[PDB]
Design an enzyme around this catalytic site. Structure first.
Site, PDB file in Angstrom:
ATOM      1  N   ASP A 147       0.865  -1.211   0.000  1.00 45.30           N
ATOM      2  CA  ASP A 147       0.000   0.000   0.000  1.00 45.30           C
ATOM      3  C   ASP A 147       0.893   1.250   0.000  1.00 45.30           C
ATOM      4  O   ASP A 147       0.558   2.195  -0.726  1.00 45.30           O
ATOM      5  CB  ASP A 147      -0.969  -0.017   1.195  1.00 45.30           C
ATOM      6  CG  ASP A 147      -2.356  -0.561   0.895  1.00 45.30           C
ATOM      7  OD1 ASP A 147      -2.479  -1.480   0.058  1.00 45.30           O
ATOM      8  OD2 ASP A 147      -3.322  -0.030   1.479  1.00 45.30           O
ATOM      9  N   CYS A 182      -1.660   0.373 -13.505  1.00 38.91           N
ATOM     10  CA  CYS A 182      -1.783   0.421 -12.019  1.00 38.91           C
ATOM     11  C   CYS A 182      -3.031   1.302 -11.825  1.00 38.91           C
ATOM     12  O   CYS A 182      -4.026   1.105 -12.578  1.00 38.91           O
ATOM     13  CB  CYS A 182      -0.460   0.849 -11.381  1.00 38.91           C
ATOM     14  SG  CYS A 182       0.328   2.273 -12.185  1.00 38.91           S
ATOM     15  N   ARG A 237       3.984   2.288 -10.754  1.00 43.02           N
ATOM     16  CA  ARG A 237       4.300   0.847 -10.809  1.00 43.02           C
ATOM     17  C   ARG A 237       4.411   0.382 -12.265  1.00 43.02           C
ATOM     18  O   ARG A 237       5.304  -0.435 -12.547  1.00 43.02           O
ATOM     19  CB  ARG A 237       3.235   0.079 -10.055  1.00 43.02           C
ATOM     20  CG  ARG A 237       3.153   0.469  -8.594  1.00 43.02           C
ATOM     21  CD  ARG A 237       2.066  -0.323  -7.930  1.00 43.02           C
ATOM     22  NE  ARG A 237       1.675   0.294  -6.684  1.00 43.02           N
ATOM     23  CZ  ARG A 237       0.586  -0.049  -5.959  1.00 43.02           C
ATOM     24  NH1 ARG A 237      -0.222  -1.021  -6.354  1.00 43.02           N
ATOM     25  NH2 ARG A 237       0.333   0.561  -4.805  1.00 43.02           N
ATOM     26  N   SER A 238       3.558   0.889 -13.143  1.00 41.41           N
ATOM     27  CA  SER A 238       3.519   0.541 -14.593  1.00 41.41           C
ATOM     28  C   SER A 238       4.855   0.906 -15.240  1.00 41.41           C
ATOM     29  O   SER A 238       5.398   0.155 -16.076  1.00 41.41           O
ATOM     30  CB  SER A 238       2.377   1.283 -15.273  1.00 41.41           C
ATOM     31  OG  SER A 238       1.094   0.806 -14.860  1.00 41.41           O
ATOM     32  N   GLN A 241       7.092   7.528 -10.191  1.00 40.48           N
ATOM     33  CA  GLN A 241       6.375   8.614  -9.471  1.00 40.48           C
ATOM     34  C   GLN A 241       7.213   9.120  -8.290  1.00 40.48           C
ATOM     35  O   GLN A 241       7.038  10.291  -7.913  1.00 40.48           O
ATOM     36  CB  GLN A 241       5.008   8.124  -8.993  1.00 40.48           C
ATOM     37  CG  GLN A 241       3.880   8.452  -9.954  1.00 40.48           C
ATOM     38  CD  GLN A 241       2.547   7.999  -9.414  1.00 40.48           C
ATOM     39  OE1 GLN A 241       2.303   6.805  -9.235  1.00 40.48           O
ATOM     40  NE2 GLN A 241       1.672   8.953  -9.143  1.00 40.48           N
TER      41      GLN A 241
END
Ligand SMILES: CS(=O)(=O)N1C[C@H](O)[C@H]2C[C@@H]1CC[C@H]2O
Length: 281
Positions: free
Chosen positions: A180, A214, A220-221, A261
């Site tokens: 998370d 994602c 994450r992608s 990110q």
């Protein structure tokens, strides 16, 4: 060599600084179609938009817009479609895109609920006997089988074009254990997952580009595509240590904004490539 660059940035704690220079150097292209008022409810986040030059167009005459980008890595001979987690109103568009682009695989890097909020619509069926029909795009989707493992689930799906009665098999690769907050402590299970996707044929040139998402389709992608492309370039080049992960990321950022990110995602990407290089040398 990146392993030494890794220890330098780590020792010096310069990850936030490297990350900021990437932000500064990153491409900025117009995203006019994304910002049209009629497309407001086709976007999950108002600050995450595909560039007009690299955006995927739906073949529907009404509105061709989906929040999705084609990332073309010429030297590695790899393409990826990066997209947001679909919305309740774009599930039909998502499957139309998968159909129109001849994709063999969907790679999902988020859970439907994280931090007690919905990050993505439930866009595939949960049981064999309860198929989904998308009336807006004339497609039917059926769960054929589901293989649940510790760190990921693989699902076989059948996608049917109700208009022409053609069917294709789609593979859904769902990485279920990304935490998370922050990034995994070890890249081992992420690498295992990436080799599973490769082994399936979903990243091969005999299929359309793999669809990766994602929640936003950038964090994450980003890490997924960056790791795959860097490892492939290390196989292909006379000198594997000529591969500069910062240059590859910047090249990928010409096609979609914001890929990777956080400074922690950047660090994780280095670790994934460095560790994956051992299983490739
Ligand atoms: C201080 S740093 O930029 O080198 N630093 C690295 C550390 O592992 C933490 C916090 C911060 C940036 C991301 C995260 O990984």
């Amino acid at each position: 060599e990146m392993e030494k660059e890794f220890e330098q940035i780590d020792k010096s704690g310069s990850w936030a600084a490297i990350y900021q220079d990437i932000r500064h150097e990153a491409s900025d292209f117009p995203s006019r179609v994304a910002k049209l008022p009629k497309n407001k409810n086709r976007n999950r986040y108002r600050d995450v938009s595909p560039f007009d030059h690299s955006r995927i167009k739906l073949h529907q005459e009404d509105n061709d817009y989906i929040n999705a980008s084609l990332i073309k890595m010429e030297e590695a001979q790899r393409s990826y479609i990066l997209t947001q987690g679909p919305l309740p109103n774009t599930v039909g568009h998502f499957w139309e895109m998968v159909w129109e682009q001849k994709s063999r695989g969907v790679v999902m890097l988020n859970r439907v609920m994280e931090k007690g909020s919905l990050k993505c619509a439930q866009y595939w069926p949960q049981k064999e006997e309860k198929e989904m029909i998308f009336e807006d795009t004339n497609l039917k989707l059926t769960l054929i089988s589901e293989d649940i493992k510790s760190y990921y689930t693989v699902r076989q799906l059948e996608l049917e074009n109700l208009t022409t009665q053609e069917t294709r098999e789609i593979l859904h690769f769902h990485y279920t254990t990304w935490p998370d907050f922050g990034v995994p402590e070890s890249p081992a299970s992420f690498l295992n997952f990436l080799f599973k996707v490769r082994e399936s044929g979903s990243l091969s040139p005999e299929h359309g580009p793999v669809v990766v998402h994602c929640s936003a389709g950038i964090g994450r992608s980003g890490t997924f595509c960056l790791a795959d492309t860097c490892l492939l370039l290390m196989d292909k080049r006379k000198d594997p240590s000529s591969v500069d992960i910062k240059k590859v990321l910047l090249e990928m950022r010409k096609f979609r904004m914001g890929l990777i990110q956080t400074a922690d995602q950047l660090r994780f990407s280095y670790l994934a490539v460095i560790e994956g290089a051992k299983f490739i040398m």
